[PDB]
Design an enzyme around this catalytic site. Structure first.
Site, mmCIF file in Angstrom:
data_model
loop_
_atom_site.group_PDB
_atom_site.id
_atom_site.type_symbol
_atom_site.label_atom_id
_atom_site.label_comp_id
_atom_site.label_asym_id
_atom_site.label_seq_id
_atom_site.Cartn_x
_atom_site.Cartn_y
_atom_site.Cartn_z
ATOM 1 N N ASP A 1 35.442 59.408 22.675
ATOM 2 C CA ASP A 1 35.626 58.728 23.945
ATOM 3 C C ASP A 1 34.277 58.366 24.548
ATOM 4 O OD1 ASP A 1 38.323 59.371 23.472
ATOM 5 O OD2 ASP A 1 38.081 61.288 24.498
ATOM 6 N N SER B 1 31.527 58.358 29.897
ATOM 7 C CA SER B 1 32.782 59.050 29.657
ATOM 8 C C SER B 1 33.923 58.086 29.935
ATOM 9 C CB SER B 1 32.908 60.289 30.535
ATOM 10 O OG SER B 1 34.153 60.928 30.344
ATOM 11 N N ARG B 2 34.808 57.910 28.955
ATOM 12 C CA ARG B 2 35.931 57.000 29.139
ATOM 13 C C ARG B 2 36.916 57.547 30.162
ATOM 14 N NH1 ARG B 2 36.648 53.063 25.401
ATOM 15 N NH2 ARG B 2 34.698 52.584 24.303
ATOM 16 N N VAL B 3 37.277 58.823 30.035
ATOM 17 C CA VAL B 3 38.205 59.432 30.981
ATOM 18 C C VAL B 3 37.687 59.270 32.402
ATOM 19 C CG1 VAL B 3 39.512 61.496 31.498
ATOM 20 C CG2 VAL B 3 38.778 61.061 29.178
#
Ligand SMILES: Nc1ncnc2c1ncn2[C@@H]1O[C@H](COP(=O)(O)OP(=O)(O)OP(=O)(O)O)[C@@H](O)[C@H]1O
Ligand SMILES: Nc1ncnc2c1ncn2[C@@H]1O[C@H](COP(=O)(O)OP(=O)(O)O)[C@@H](O)[C@H]1O
Ligand SMILES: [Mg+2]
Ligand SMILES: [Mg+2]
Lengths: 470, 90, 513, 36, 109, 124, 123
Positions: C347, C372-374
């Site tokens: 991610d 960070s994708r999240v």
């Protein structure tokens, strides 16, 4: 009675045909009828009772059908005090011309690394007398030590100084295995140890063993002589819980020799022409070089960096095995600084406030920040000059130049080059000297006095003397 | 063409371009002050213009060198791969 | 043609003789060739791909190449033991490793054998090392934080449970340090008993010397953070197949927790080294080499692994398995083969710079590249707000840093931004083995974004941090307790904080300007 | 085509000039101070 | 040194020409004769037209000639012209022998 | 082959239903990368920078089945990942050979509060 | 060229050739910085070198007879003596005052001077 016989000879790789009871891998085979003792190390079973092996000596003069004898054990070399003060070959032959070697027993150069439960790691500062090393990258008694350097940066001279400074006045024994390096250096080191009385003709003395697998030797010899030196040290460690100093002159030659025959052995080449088994071949050697419950081994190995490319697979993989790392930089040599120890790149697992004094850790970090800040300014200094900088930046530049020059230390082994006698610096004096420089103790004196000096007091006296001279 | 040298040369030009850009900022500030005070301003104006031109020229060269670095990188990958394949064929 | 390895003289001789005796060809094999840890075996039919086989001596092997006339096996041990002619019997079972709770607090080999010597391992059952990752349905959105304890990470690069975050950087930049710091922070829940937060940690060592592993275990035992962590070791001396299996063995141990509703964190150290081991096995098997001599399916090797870290839905139990793979870039170039693969798989990536490490920035995290994708979805309600402003300020400061050396010459309101950014970067610094609770992070990041730090001198930021936390921890304990339970920074707490911080700065002995 | 060497030479030369002058000043000042 | 009777400083010079046009070596020999420096010089020639094995053995052949003087208390100077050319010849001779190539197609050793 | 599977689902609607289809493809670079891996596994000698020799053909197959016909049309919006930011890389280069338009999303537009991220100038 | 030596060719011919090469190499060592930033900050001697090197580099070019259709200008054949004299006078600074365009596609130094003198005369 010889069961096998030579069937194929290409370069240093030799194939043997056996009639029955093939030898296990890594065993040593003796070819009969050669003017010199020729040994073959089993590397592969090709089937049909055929084995592919690597020769330790030149294969010129071999002939198809020549009988081969199986010893039934890997290459065994004499161990014990009989090797002390005597030059030995990869297969255990004495090349010093002083006679046969007396050994309590013969140990094989191939063995399994020590277990995890008997690792017994321990951290203890090792005073080498070199202020840059003692300050930025402290060495640990019983831990691996790496000297990464390109061609002609001074790692060979550094090995000699460590010997002069550490080998002597060392209760335990010391081993020096020089693999792949030039033979001229070998003669110099032998005579130097004799002069320094580290080795002598008189028996019961000469607490140091020598192993040489230099360039002139063909592949397979340069690839296994390192294991030979390591085996001697393991005996001295296990059988006697005595601290051992292992000096390995360039180890990069070990992997290089392996790759020289990897192709003929059948392996496919890897990324940069190295064998696929680079990491495992190297790790099998590194894991054996370690301190254990019985004894401790302090290994100082030089890694040649081809073309100053630290990303090469060989040194890149070695980095992971080392506790202390010393990276030699070529730019410093151009500046005249010796030793050319890159203060920023060099790292030590022992550089911890818990292991060493907090003051030591604090002083080291300050030096690194000072030098790094100076390196950042160089760019703008090129365009604008030192004048246009602020007083803060000027003080940084001034103090950094003095510190960088003060890092240079003249060693005994280097006199012939420079003409100034060597010098030894204690740990306390070293930390205090650099601590004082940070506080501005020497910002008054010229930077020229902080060159090839041992301690800060010596440097200040020289500066004052030059003034009264002029 | 020895990508290591190209990257070094690329890094140098970036620092030059960065330092030249900063001096243009400083020259604008100082030129403003002199015009407020008002030849000195003329010196600053020429310096600001010259740094702009120099940063512009450096940027063009950096882009051109980046193309060559990518070109060299592709060739290096290709050349190494061919060595490996030739060794594996036999 | 040239020849076939299955056309051995001994096997051919039997055919010419005319005696049809194969000594139970099925489930039994005879070694034909041995080299570099790879043994080719004639016969041994009915052997599944990836199955364990026993040699005459006792060492095991893995059948990886099922060819027409032979089987290419990788020996799981020293190659010197077995020689040509030896017999090979298939164990009859794919490679599996033991799992359970009784393993936490023990050092294991790649196959589950305890090497620490503390005694025999008592567990209930075993799990297969190679299985498929969860689908799309069993999964669930990543909404729960995994507090590493690192200020920079928890604020700017949040990691949620079930996420795959890549710790990438050059050698000796502080990658393993971040992993260990995470493990230490997770210890408060076990000590306190907050089952909801308990996160079992798994450390996988690939291509590492045993000395550093012993030091690593001593640190964990020193900080007591052992007894809830599992160390899987595939050292440099271990054969290449072991370095290739260790990550999968560890992932299976973590799937145990994930399936049962427990939360587990797995760290793969020197993941790049695992690729090197796989490359060796592949090249010795004479499989077609690709870029940098890596096999074609190297990417696959990593995907099927990392994709097993997931956040299972509440139906299956709600468990999760968070991954933290490590990657060592040689010249800080992520354009290499293995970095690009693992970056495309994961991610986000935590990118560590060595130059920053020199400049005294520890952890040497480059927030510009780190992503960070999240994102905010992982952070607690209190952080998200202030973290956004923090990211913006750092972005502007990195843009302006190009003029740092020209400070007084530049006009005002710009040099001020430069000064502010320095305070923040100094605040983000942190010592090794010193993880911070999330509540304390909120107070410090709050003091920084509000601008109160602009008064102090940069050299005093860290002293204020430690000293101010001690005062807040001592006096304002209800404030921290609310931030910890509620999980958000209420308006009242914001005002309370905003009033005492400057007051503390004044009464504090540290100078200001 | 070598701009890095140009900067390195420029940096070295300017530092040497400035700090050579500083060394002159430092020797004079300490000499004045050592004599009394 | 040779003209004057000082043996302790005489240095026999050996020039090994690997992969060079014979015209170049001829001009060089004429230059040596012009200065009368050829009386103590030895020239080993493995030109571009010569087979690769010859270019491979010439340096080793010259070195053996020098070992004569070395082992006999004399001093010899051997000048190997481009060794890169010897490596090319060895690469050619080895590749034609079907030996597995290394980086830049050069043999491993 | 997953890309071709989605393409086939769309072709039904185009031919039978006769309606316009919109085919979104997660970055086509991964499709190109997977083809390269199978070629290597099959033992085919790799091309210039490690890609398969059939890059153009493997890519052209999918890109050609996507077109307008008398019954309907399949308009494809595909994500482009540029490895190492090298537009001259074989994969993005052979791809651009097919692209008719490009939509570039910019982060700055998001910061300004405009949340179609498309850039007017960069888009072509 | 192996032929370039003081004994085979005249010592004058060799000195002129080496001077041209030294001049051009010095100018080539400065092209990077001049590209990044102009020649204004450049020293006076270095600026003279730059000007003179441009002149010489332009003067090196010459129209050919076979290339007469392309350019449309008649080719030039330059005797060795005229060539050496032209380059000797140019290194000494004979044509430094004139513009560099008068040396483009000229056979001998006198031709360039006449064009340059006419340009000075026109204005
Ligand atoms: N926050 C920190 N503050 C100060 N020093 C640190 C910090 N983190 C790491 N260090 C030091 O930086 C070095 C690297 O530590 P660590 O082994 O964890 O990183 P690494 O990149 O994994 O090293 P390796 O390449 O050998 O695996 C060590 O000397 C460590 O003591
Ligand atoms: N301390 C030193 N002081 C001055 N000159 C040095 C010093 N160390 C090395 N030199 C020079 O460095 C060279 C030696 O480099 P060396 O240690 O042999 O590296 P390597 O083993 O790779 O050849 C010698 O020319 C030597 O004169
Ligand atoms: Mg050396
Ligand atoms: Mg680490």
């Amino acid at each position: 009675k010889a069961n096998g016989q030579v069937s194929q000879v290409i370069g240093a790789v030799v194939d043997v045909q056996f009639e029955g009871e093939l030898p296990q891998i890594l065993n040593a085979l003796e070819v009969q009828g050669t003017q010199h003792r020729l040994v073959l190390e089993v590397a592969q079973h090709l089937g049909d009772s055929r084995v592919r092996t690597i020769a330790m000596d030149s294969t010129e003069g071999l002939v198809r059908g020549q009988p081969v004898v199986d010893t039934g054990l890997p290459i065994s070399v004499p161990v014990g005090p009989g090797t002390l003060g005597r030059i030995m070959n990869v297969i255990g032959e004495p090349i010093d011309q002083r006679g046969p070697i007396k050994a309590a027993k013969l140990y094989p150069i191939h063995r399994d690394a020590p277990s995890f439960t008997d690792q017994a790691t321990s951290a203890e500062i090792l005073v080498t007398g070199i202020k840059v090393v003692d300050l930025l990258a402290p060495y640990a008694r019983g831990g691996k030590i790496g000297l990464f350097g390109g061609a002609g940066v001074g790692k060979t001279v550094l090995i000699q100084e460590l010997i002069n400074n550490v080998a002597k006045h060392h209760g335990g024994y010391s081993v020096f295995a020089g693999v792949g390096e030039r033979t001229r250096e070998g003669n110099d080191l032998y005579h130097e140890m004799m002069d320094s009385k580290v080795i002598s003709v008189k028996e019961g003395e000469s607490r140091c063993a020598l192993i040489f697998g230099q360039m002139n030797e063909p592949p397979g010899a340069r690839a296994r002589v390192g294991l030979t030196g390591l085996t001697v040290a393991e005996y001295f460690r296990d059988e006697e819980g005595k601290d051992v100093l292992l000096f390995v002159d360039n180890i990069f030659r070990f992997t290089q020799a392996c790759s020289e025959v990897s192709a003929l052995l059948g392996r496919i080449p890897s990324a940069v022409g190295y064998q696929p088994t680079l990491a495992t071949d190297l790790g099998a050697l590194q894991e054996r070089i370690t301190t254990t419950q019985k004894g401790s081994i302090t290994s100082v190995q030089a890694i040649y960096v081809p073309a100053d490319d630290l990303t090469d697979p060989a040194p890149a993989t070695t980095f992971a095995h080392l506790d202390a790392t010393t990276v030699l930089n070529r730019g410093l040599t151009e500046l005249g600084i010796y030793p050319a120890v890159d203060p920023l790149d060099s790292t030590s697992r022992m550089l911890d406030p818990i292991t060493i004094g907090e003051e030591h850790y604090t002083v080291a970090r300050g030096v690194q920040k000072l030098l790094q800040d100076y390196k950042s300014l160089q760019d703008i200094i090129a365009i604008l000059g030192v004048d246009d900088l602020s007083e803060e930046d000027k003080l940084v530049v001034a103090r950094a130049r003095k510190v960088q020059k003060f890092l240079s230390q003249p060693f005994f082994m280097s006199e012939v080059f420079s003409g100034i006698p060597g010098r030894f610096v204690n740990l306390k004096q070293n930390i205090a000297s650099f601590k004082a420089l940070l506080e501005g103790a020497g910002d008054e004196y010229p930077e020229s006095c902080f060159y090839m000096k041992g301690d800060l007091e010596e440097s200040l006296a020289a500066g004052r003397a030059d003034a009264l001279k002029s | 063409a020895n990508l290591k040298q190209l990257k070094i040369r690329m890094k140098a030009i970036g620092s030059i371009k960065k330092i030249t850009k900063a001096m243009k900022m400083v020259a604008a500030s100082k030129m403003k002050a002199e015009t407020s005070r008002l030849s000195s301003a003329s010196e600053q104006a020429s310096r600001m213009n010259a740094m702009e031109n120099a940063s512009k020229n450096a940027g063009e060269i950096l882009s051109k060198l980046t193309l060559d670095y990518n070109k060299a990188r592709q060739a290096k990958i290709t050349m190494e791969l061919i060595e490996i394949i030739s060794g594996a064929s036999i | 043609k040239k020849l076939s390895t299955g056309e051995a003289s001994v096997v051919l001789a039997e055919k010419i003789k005319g005696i049809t005796q194969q000594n139970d060809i099925t489930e039994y094999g005879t070694v034909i060739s041995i080299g570099d840890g790879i043994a080719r075996v004639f016969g041994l039919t009915k052997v599944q791909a990836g199955e364990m086989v026993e040699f005459k001596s006792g060492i095991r092997g893995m059948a990886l190449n099922l060819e027409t006339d032979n089987v290419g096996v990788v020996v799981l041990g020293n190659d010197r033991d077995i020689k040509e002619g030896d017999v090979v019997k298939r164990t009859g079972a794919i490679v599996d490793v033991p799992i359970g709770e009784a393993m936490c607090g023990r050092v294991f080999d790649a196959l589950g054998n305890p090497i620490d010597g503390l005694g025999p391992l008592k567990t209930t059952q075993r799990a297969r090392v190679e299985i498929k990752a969860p689908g799309i349905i069993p999964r669930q959105s990543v909404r729960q934080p995994m507090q590493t304890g690192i200020k920079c990470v928890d604020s700017l690069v949040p990691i949620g449970r079930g996420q795959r975050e890549l710790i990438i950087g050059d050698r000796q930049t502080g990658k393993t340090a971040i992993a260990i710091d995470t493990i230490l922070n997770q210890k408060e829940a076990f000590n306190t008993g907050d089952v909801k937060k308990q996160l079992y940690c798994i450390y996988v060592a690939v291509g590492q010397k045993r000395s550093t592993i012993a030091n690593l275990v001593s640190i964990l035992k020193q900080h007591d953070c052992m007894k809830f962590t599992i160390v899987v070791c595939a050292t440099a001396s271990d054969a290449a197949p072991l370095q290739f299996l260790a990550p999968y063995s560890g992932c299976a141990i973590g799937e145990f927790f994930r399936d049962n509703g427990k939360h587990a964190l797995i760290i793969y150290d020197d993941l790049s080294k695992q690729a090197v081991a796989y490359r060796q096995m592949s090249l010795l098997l004479r499989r077609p080499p690709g870029r940098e001599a890596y096999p074609g399916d190297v990417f696959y090797l990593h995907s099927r692994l990392l994709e097993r870290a997931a956040k299972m839905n509440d139906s299956l139990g709600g468990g999760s398995l968070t991954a933290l793979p490590v990657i060592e870039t040689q010249a800080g170039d992520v354009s290499a083969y293995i970095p690009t693969n693992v970056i495309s798989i994961t991610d986000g990536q935590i990118f560590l710079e060595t130059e920053l490490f020199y400049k005294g920035i520890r952890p040497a995290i480059n927030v510009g590249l780190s992503v960070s994708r999240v994102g905010s979805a992982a952070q607690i309600k209190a952080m998200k707000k202030i973290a956004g402003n923090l990211k913006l300020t750092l972005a502007t400061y990195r843009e302006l840093a190009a003029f740092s050396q020209f400070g007084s010459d530049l006009d005002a309101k710009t040099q001020q931004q430069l000064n502010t950014g320095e305070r923040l970067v100094e605040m983000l610094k942190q010592n090794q083995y010193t993880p911070m609770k999330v509540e304390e992070q909120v107070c410090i990041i709050f003091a920084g974004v509000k601008g109160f730090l602009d008064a102090l001198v940069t050299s005093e930021v860290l002293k204020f941090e430690k000293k101010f936390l001690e005062h807040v921890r001592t006096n304002h304990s209800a404030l921290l307790k609310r931030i910890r339970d509620s999980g958000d920074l209420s308006e009242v707490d914001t005002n309370e904080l905003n009033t005492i911080i400057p007051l503390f700065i004044q009464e504090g002995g540290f100078k200001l300007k | 085509t070598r701009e890095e060497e140009w900067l390195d030479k420029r940096t070295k030369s300017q530092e040497k000039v400035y700090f050579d002058q500083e060394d002159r000043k430092a020797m004079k000042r300490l000499l004045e101070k050592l004599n009394t």
